[PDB]
Design a binder for this molecule. Sequence first.
Ligand SMILES: [Cl-]
Ligand SMILES: [Cl-]
Lengths: 133, 133
Amino acid sequence: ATPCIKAISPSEGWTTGGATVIIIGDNFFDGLQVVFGTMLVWSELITPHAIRVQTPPRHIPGVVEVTLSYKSKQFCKGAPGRFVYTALNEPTIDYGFQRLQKVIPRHPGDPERLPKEVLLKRAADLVEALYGM
Amino acid sequence: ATPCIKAISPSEGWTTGGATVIIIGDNFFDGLQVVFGTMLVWSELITPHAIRVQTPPRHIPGVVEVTLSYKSKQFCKGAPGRFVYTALNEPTIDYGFQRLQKVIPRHPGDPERLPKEVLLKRAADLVEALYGM
Ligand SMILES: [Cl-]
Ligand SMILES: [Cl-]
């Protein structure tokens, strides 16, 4: 009757945290906590087979073990969930945004530096016109 | 032993579709089909309590019922999942990436899901071919 993790969805998120994640498994109950590496968060019980959490921030990117905890007892250490944190400022991601900043078309009224949301919006507009539909 | 939906997560998404939704319930099996409104969608069994799907696009905002089907028999009509399609708001980083994941050209030997850095590298390659000095 111990809580067990069978799957986690999504399995990745940004280091800034705040993503909704569903943990699927067995023997869940109200009050169960979830630990991402060392970062503990509380959960919402959906059914005994699913709980919902918001990811905690993590200082560094990388793979973490996801385990469960209740009254400081750890569960799932022998079969932990896997969750991957990515940093928006990882050098290869950042270099991609720097490339886009130089060639994304600027529209009247734009700020001097286009925000990343806009770089991505217009890159997708352009790629959709090439390969979309 | 009747398949039953207890919840869906998330229960809203954009009209453009392509979001991962987990359908949580009881008595799920391989070959059970998922219907969003009137659209049959591809699904994958995670456990007998969880199915994963990708939302189909829907041109018009609003609620649809999620029901299940097997051998043309319908389940869950009396207690369906309710999924709300939502008109697009301001561009976000994640939405921009979701758009690129759908249209960035794939190469032989690519992972099913391109990493963010690869989405950007390829988007930058294409945009530099349009506007690069
Ligand atoms: Cl543009
Ligand atoms: Cl993506």
